[PDB]
Ligand SMILES: *C(=N)c1nn(-c2ccc(C(F)(F)F)cc2)c(=O)n(CCc2ccccn2)c1=O
């Protein structure tokens with residue numbers, strides 16, 4: 333068959349997406365059991381966004397100030413709390429549709445699905461990847477804050493991402509479900525320096541592996557290369573350096589294709605040095621680093 | 634914010650995805666109300682796949698031969714029927730989770746979401762587009778037949794696509810929910826000629842429009858061009874010819890950007906003639922034709 337960027341199915345998460353409004357500000361929350369998780373900066377007014385004192389602002393806000401609507405269902409707040417950058421608004425009504433869920437902090441390179449919501453209603457779903465500058469590139473208009481990113485292995489939903497802010501650079505930053513930001517970012521309207529963005533080399537190999545499986549074998553060179561010397565090429569082109577754990581996770585892909593991992597590193601060396609000269613892999617003229625090895629096997633088998 | 638290929642949320646469709654097995658063959662069905670829709674060729678054995686006589690095979694098969702499982706729920710068949718290339722297996726249990734749905738036949742160029750299922754369980758969701766050879770490029774492994782494509786405007790699910798077969802060419806063909814194939818294809822294991830695949834010019838303009846909105850304005854040339862003479866460029870490069878209906882549907886995008894439609898056709902003329910010379914729009918070194926004008930506005934506003 334074929335290879336496309338595929339999101340996990342979204343239903344288990346849609347019935348967790350509520351509407352959260354404090355004062356004049358409206359953003360999405362995540363209602364799991366009897367707690368509704370949402371970004372802190374819901375309690376900010378425009379004036380406080382340079383550097384708000386969140387503690388002080390929360391002191392002022394009231395449980396009745398916190399307004400939770402699950403669609404046309406109307407939830408009522410019985411507690412409030414600040415875990416790092418998130419608020420936990422305890423409620424009376426527990427969710428009948430709470431899935432088996434875990435809170436997980438993802439590592440750079442990992443991919444997840446994003447359910448983009450506005451005003452508590454889901455609008456669309458798309459696959460993102462966490463990057464080595466701990467930023468994500470996604471679609472987030474005004475009001476999309478609170479939208480969550482998640483993986484579904486087996487029956488379990490593993491929430492890893494709550495969106496908070498767009499950066500002046502156009503990329504997006506956010507936190508895990510315990511409220512800590514990925515990367516150095518803070519929930520202030522400050523200029524914040526994202527760092528250099530290094531391509532997930534193990535992902536690009538896995539994509540190329542998914543190409544040989546799906547009928548694209550032009551890049552396959554008769555050559556080979558060494559891990560140390562591939563990485564010299566890698567650092568030149570700002571590619572994350574390959575390790576043996578990387579080689580090992582590609583093992584299952586190595587076997588089915590019967591193309592050794594170092595052989596593919598050599599095909600990737602020429603593609604970096606000689607570019608593409610006008611051909612395409614899997615329908616792209618760019619090297620693609622947002623498919624993990626896991627993403628490929630799940631799609632290609 | 635940003636621009637990504639976004640699928641519609643999938644929950645309303647997941648709870649319609651059942652398991653359908655006839656004889657030794659297992660594929661997915663779509664259970665709406667008291668009818669479970671699935672591809673005909675479920676009733677084929679390997680020997681009959683050159684050119685099966687479907688009528689005759691259905692005569693032989695029995696209601697009890699038709700086995701429907703909604704996850705661990707067990708549905709029981711009380712009728713059977715052949716509408717073109719689909720079977721309608723009436724059942725006793727109506728779906729408690731049937732959404733407000735319509736059956737629609739899409740026109741070439743239109744985009745929809747695909748819920749990829751195996752054995753009745755959804756695995757992933759991704760955006761496809763119907764193309765002018767009436768084929769789709771997607772991810773469809775063995776057992777994915779019966780997976781459906783759909784749009785969700787408002788609260789209504791508009792099913793347009795049931796997958797049936799992969800072609801020897803690697804692309805995918807299927808039917809509407811009334812069973813008629815898009816394009817000239819038949820449910821036979823024959824070599825079948827897909828035709829020439831023309832790029833949806835109105836989609837590529839809409840994508841470029843979505844780029845100016847999202848901070849990519851390098852392609853914007855100070856030039857202009859004529860509809861007749863742009864189309865001369867279009868036919869050279871095998872691009873679907875632009876009409877005034879096309880220009881009109883881009884009106885809302887023309888206004889917000891303040892870039893006339895013919896100006897963008899001129900930027901597209903140079904990109905076709907001079908290529909990209911190594912730059913990228915929206916993260917791609919290819920011209921993208923699987924965003925309708927509707928897809929762009931829904932994402933960019
Ligand atoms: C997402 N829902 C959203 N988030 N912010 C926002 C608020 C505060 C911070 C802080 F700096 F404190 F971290 C970061 C990001 C928004 O400002 N907006 C814009 C709301 C809006 C309303 C009307 C017109 C324009 N914009 C958000 O949507």
Ligand SMILES: *C(=N)c1nn(-c2ccc(C(F)(F)F)cc2)c(=O)n(CCc2ccccn2)c1=O
Nearest residue numbers: 660674682774775776777778797798820821822
């Ligand atoms: C999808 N579920 C699927 N469909 N076909 C298939 C069957 C019949 C036709 C016809 F020509 F009649 F139109 C087209 C397509 C499949 O053949 N398979 C393969 C099943 C399989 C099982 C074990 C090992 C390999 N393949 C499908 O999966």
